[PDB]
């Protein structure tokens, strides 16, 4: 009763109030597009002749992704984002339940390792052509978690050896205000913070000097709408910090995820709090109306986009958890329409059947790797009730072996590291434990259109399968 | 016909370096003859760290083919600095890129670095250009964030005059007149009126602000932007919702509403306002009932969320 189907709801345009604008022109036009596609399509929940079947065309999407061979020349516009092309593919294939043979995996590992600079960090291409960058670094580390292993050719061994260099790269990126440059001379925003914190958490290279002000930079990104902007500006430690743009689906995902990762760090008065209830509110307000397929939009008064199913939808359980903790500080139905979102994916976000395959921004747009990956990532979050379980974190604390682990990182500043071995080990335990604290609630599963639509469970915050996240992070914390 | 750089006299002295992504790499791209050749020589240029005019020209060749090549952009700016090139000339080049590139992080950051280094005494000319830049795409996130940085940076240097701020607010007002649904413009207004360090906060500045917000809502009652701004406003300044309620109540069926054509009632956000009003009065039971109506009828997409709010009352 709390996750009604789009088909069971009245489809009505956004009212004009007799004041037309450019925004409203696009909104209506887009409303017609999605609305008509839904009309052509059979209701996924029913048991209709001549109407299109909305079933998840998994084999088409797999073939769309097969294009592990070579990309058309027009992909030069992403020559600096090849690790993303790898991640979008190997992660989508993981969600679609399609395995790569060992030979193909080795290729993936070898390719990425060629993007690794000895000075530290991954670039968007071969190290002899591109400099390290926080984004390709995240995409590469994550891809190695999916396609690699712990053999001499698995890649994980190479990461472990590069830990000190990657850390030193991270420090060169660090600004005093708590922000990071995405690369040497590069821009500064929560994308970099997110990608950096994810890798530092997974590879066990987190230090106090790494985190200073990082929390303040993120809190200050939150706007009046409740979501988070790309960055915050520090007026000269700083007198005050101001958000620099609109609350944005992507940047809100990066902000929520970053802040969440910080909450498990054993520092005092760290991290600076955010307004969890305002983040949740902004999140749920971004889900479209029935007429627009109940897909997510990334900004107020802009169009729904399939890729935001992950950026916005995937942030919901992180915000929901932060709200939960908020209420426990002083002292259940779903928080967004888990049904409508799946319907948007199945009906509107999939490529027309019998064609190239792949998922897309919206009807009228060409499918691509990026939207394929994010549409399915969101679909996962909607199909599977994800929760951060304290009892599971507690269970993780009990089984954690502090005697095992890779060599501590050497801080840039003498006092940059943890006060002592005890503080460091308690920090290792907390970070590791909480990182493995996400569970799929049993009985919480909802699979619109039948079990043949089911895809695998992705982890919030990290966005790789739990069965990847566990063996991977366990390797670097030597908890195997 | 293309002339390979290997046959160019100006480059005869350079030994090009092939791309090294190993054997049988995944996600390989079918580069054009031009692109591959340029990168082949860039690899050699950057490897030897040559700071020259030809290196500079090469970077323009590359970034034109791939506006997102962050590595090449980084090398280019280090060339501008090293060769002590005219940053003004480079700024005019960036005006060509800003035309068709639009959403490239590397283009925008490059422009930011330029203006940081140039550090003009008066950024008025750049401010103007940004405004003009927004005509083709009034919601370009990169652009808005850049304008935020420009005013924040140069105001920290004390170079934003009161006349400058005043005209900016005029321009913002004009943006919202042309499209009151432009949430980017609303965000800018928040910066100008609220968040910026030098914002005027008086018991009469608030008056004007409410007047503006309310009239905006009455012109377009279903505008999510205006409603969010209204709530963020009251919340930021810790103002009570109750007193302003008479202007919102009509939408649950100081400036007051008219009613405009094509204006279905009730407005869900007006109901949220009413519900939170009850909470402000400690009438949790009356708040629950409107939360329940949002969940059941008036905003069913968020049935679960409004159900959560309804329980939050109990």
């Amino acid at each position: 009763e709390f996750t009604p189907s789009v088909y069971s709801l009245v489809s009505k345009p956004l009212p004009s109030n007799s004041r037309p604008s450019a925004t409203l022109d696009e909104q209506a036009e887009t409303e017609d597009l999605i609305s008509q596609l839904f009309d052509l399509t059979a209701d996924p929940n029913a048991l209709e002749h001549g109407k299109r079947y909305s079933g998840l065309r998994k084999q088409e999407h797999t073939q769309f992704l097969a294009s592990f061979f070579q990309l058309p020349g027009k992909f030069v516009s992403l020559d600096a984002s090849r690790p993303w092309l790898v991640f979008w593919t190997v992660h989508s294939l993981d969600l679609l339940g399609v395995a790569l043979d060992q030979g193909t995996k080795d290729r993936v590992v070898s390719t990425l390792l060629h993007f690794l600079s000895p000075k530290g960090g991954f670039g968007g291409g071969p190290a002899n052509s591109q400099i390290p960058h926080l984004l390709p670094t995240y995409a590469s580390v994550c891809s190695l978690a999916i396609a690699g292993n712990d053999s001499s050719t698995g890649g994980w061994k190479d990461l472990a050896a590069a830990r000190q260099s990657i850390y030193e790269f991270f420090m060169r990126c660090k600004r005093p205000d708590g922000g990071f440059v995405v690369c040497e001379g590069g821009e500064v925003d929560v994308r970099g913070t997110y990608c950096l914190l994810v890798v530092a958490t997974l590879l066990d290279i987190i230090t106090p000097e790494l985190l200073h002000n990082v929390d303040k930079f993120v809190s200050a990104c939150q706007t009046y709408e409740g979501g988070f902007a790309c960055a915050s500006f520090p007026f000269p430690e700083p007198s005050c910090r101001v958000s620099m743009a609109e609350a944005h689906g992507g940047y809100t995902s990066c902000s929520l995820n970053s802040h969440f990762l910080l909450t498990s760090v054993p520092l005092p008065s760290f991290p600076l709090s955010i307004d969890a209830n305002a983040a949740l509110r902004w999140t749920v307000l971004q889900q479209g109306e029935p007429i627009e397929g109940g897909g997510f939009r990334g900004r107020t008064n802009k169009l729904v986009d399939g890729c935001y199913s992950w950026w916005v939808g995937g942030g919901a359980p992180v915000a929901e958890e932060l709200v939960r903790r908020e209420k426990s500080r002083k002292v259940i139905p779903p928080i967004f329409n888990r049904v409508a979102l799946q319907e948007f994916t199945l009906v509107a976000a999939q490529q027309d059947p019998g064609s190239t395959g792949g998922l897309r921004d919206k009807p009228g747009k060409r499918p691509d790797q990026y939207h394929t990956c994010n549409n399915l990532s969101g679909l996962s979050i909607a199909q599977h009730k994800m929760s951060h379980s304290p009892s599971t974190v507690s269970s993780n604390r009990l089984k954690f072996d502090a005697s095992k682990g890779l060599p501590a990182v050497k801080p840039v500043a003498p006092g940059g590291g943890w006060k002592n071995e005890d503080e460091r080990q308690n920090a290792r335990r907390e970070i590791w434990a909480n990182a493995l604290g996400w569970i799929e609630e049993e009985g919480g599963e909802i699979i619109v259109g039948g079990k043949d639509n089911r895809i695998n469970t992705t982890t919030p915050v990290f966005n790789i399968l739990g069965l990847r996240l566990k063996p991977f992070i366990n390797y670097f914390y030597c908890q195997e | 016909t293309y002339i390979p750089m290997s046959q160019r006299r100006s480059w005869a002295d350079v030994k090009p370096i092939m791309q090294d992504d190993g054997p049988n790499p995944v996600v390989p791209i079918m580069y054009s003859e031009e692109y591959k050749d340029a990168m082949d020589y860039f690899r050699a240029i950057a490897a030897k760290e040559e700071k020259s005019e030809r290196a500079l020209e090469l970077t323009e060749i590359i970034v034109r083919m791939n506006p997102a090549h962050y590595t090449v952009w980084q090398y280019r700016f280090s060339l501008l600095t090293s060769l002590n090139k005219s940053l003004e000339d480079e700024l005019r080049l960036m005006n060509e890129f800003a035309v068709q590139n639009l959403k490239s992080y590397q283009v925008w950051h490059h422009r930011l670095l330029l203006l940081d280094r140039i550090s003009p005494q008066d950024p008025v000319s750049e401010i103007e250009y940004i405004h003009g830049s927004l005509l083709p795409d009034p919601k370009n996130y990169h652009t808005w964030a850049y304008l935020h940085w420009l005013y924040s940076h140069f105001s920290t240097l004390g170079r934003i005059s009161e006349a400058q701020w005043g005209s900016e607010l005029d321009w913002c007002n004009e943006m919202l007149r042309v499209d009151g649904r432009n949430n980017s413009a609303w965000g800018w207004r928040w910066y100008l009126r609220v968040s910026r360090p030098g914002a005027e906060t008086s018991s009469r500045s608030l008056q004007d602000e409410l007047i503006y917000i309310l009239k905006s809502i009455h012109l377009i009652p279903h505008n999510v932007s205006a409603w969010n701004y209204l709530r963020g406003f009251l919340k930021h300044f810790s103002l009570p919702l109750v007193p302003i309620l008479p202007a919102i109540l009509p939408y649950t069926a100081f400036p007051m509403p008219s009613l405009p054509e094509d204006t279905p009632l009730p407005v869900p956000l007006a109901l949220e306002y009413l519900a939170d009003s009850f909470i402000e009065q400690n009438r949790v039971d009356d708040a629950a009932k409107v939360f329940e109506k949002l969940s059941s009828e008036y905003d069913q997409m968020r049935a679960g969320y409004w159900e959560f709010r309804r329980r939050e009352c109990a």
């Binding site: 600096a80 960058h133 986009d305 060409r366 | 997102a68 962050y70």
Partner: peptide, 9 residues
């Protein structure tokens, strides 16, 4: 069917 304008890097 035009391409989507979604850059993340």
């Amino acid at each position: 069917p035009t391409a989507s304008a979604c850059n993340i890097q």
